[PDB]
């Protein structure tokens, strides 16, 4: 069937521009999003120590 | 006879796409910016004027001697 993605007209009123004005000017974007999704560093590194450890196979 | 298809136990996982964790929007921002900015200016005039008081004190010792 259908789906129309990335197809949405803007708000264009008094208050909702302040959500798009604080975004560009003071960067509430790009740090709450992209500075937190990188860190996300505390997870365990899934590395195989190849001369000692070995991975799975199949019969 | 030992084939796969299980009787039950299913989800699924979503095809959904959403994480609107906002986030102090809509005039709540620009409010913590301005007040903390003038707070830094409020920290002035109690230090520069205070150092200005010591600045005349520093020049005082120069003028009192030197005859």
UniProtKB/Swiss-Prot annotation, chain A:
Similarity-based family: Belongs to the complex I 23 kDa subunit family.
UniProt feature coiled coil, ranges: none
Function, as annotated: Core subunit of the mitochondrial membrane respiratory chain NADH dehydrogenase (Complex I) which catalyzes electron transfer from NADH through the respiratory chain, using ubiquinone as an electron acceptor. Essential for the catalytic activity and assembly of complex I.
Highest rank taxon of the organism: Eukaryota
Subunit field text: Core subunit of respiratory chain NADH dehydrogenase (Complex I) which is composed of 45 different subunits. This is a component of the iron-sulfur (IP) fragment of the enzyme. Interacts with RAB5IF.
Residue span relative to the full protein: 37 to 95 of 212
Subcellular location: Mitochondrion inner membrane
Organism: Bos taurus (Bovine)
Name of the featured protein: NADH dehydrogenase [ubiquinone] iron-sulfur protein 8, mitochondrial
UniProtKB/Swiss-Prot annotation, chain B:
Bilayer-crossing regions: 24-45
Subcellular location: Mitochondrion inner membrane; Nucleus
Superkingdom of this protein's organism: Eukaryota
Subunit structure: Complex I is composed of 45 different subunits. Interacts with CARD15, but not with CARD4. Interacts with STAT3, but not with STAT1, STAT2 and STAT5A. Interacts with OLFM4.
Known role: Accessory subunit of the mitochondrial membrane respiratory chain NADH dehydrogenase (Complex I), that is believed not to be involved in catalysis. Complex I functions in the transfer of electrons from NADH to the respiratory chain. The immediate electron acceptor for the enzyme is believed to be ubiquinone. Involved in the interferon/all-trans-retinoic acid (IFN/RA) induced cell death. This apoptotic activity is inhibited by interaction with viral IRF1. Prevents the transactivation of STAT3 target genes.
Family the UniProt entry places it in: Belongs to the complex I NDUFA13 subunit family.
Name assigned to this protein: NADH dehydrogenase [ubiquinone] 1 alpha subcomplex subunit 13
């Amino acid at each position: 069937t259908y789906k129309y993605v990335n197809l949405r007209e803007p708000s264009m009123d008094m208050k909702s521009v302040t959500d798009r004005a604080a975004q560009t000017l003071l960067w509430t974007e790009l740090i709450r999003g992209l500075g937190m999704t990188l860190s996300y560093l505390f997870r365990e590194p899934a590395t195989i120590n190849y001369p000692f450890e070995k991975g799975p196979l199949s019969p | 006879k030992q084939d796969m298809p299980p009787v039950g136990g299913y989800g699924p996982i979503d095809y959904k796409r959403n994480l609107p964790r906002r986030g102090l929007s809509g005039y709540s921002m620009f409010a913590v910016g301005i007040g903390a900015l003038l707070f830094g200016y409020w920290s002035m005039m109690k230090w520069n004027r205070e150092r200005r008081r010591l600045q005349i004190e520093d020049f005082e010792a120069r003028i009192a001697l030197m005859p």
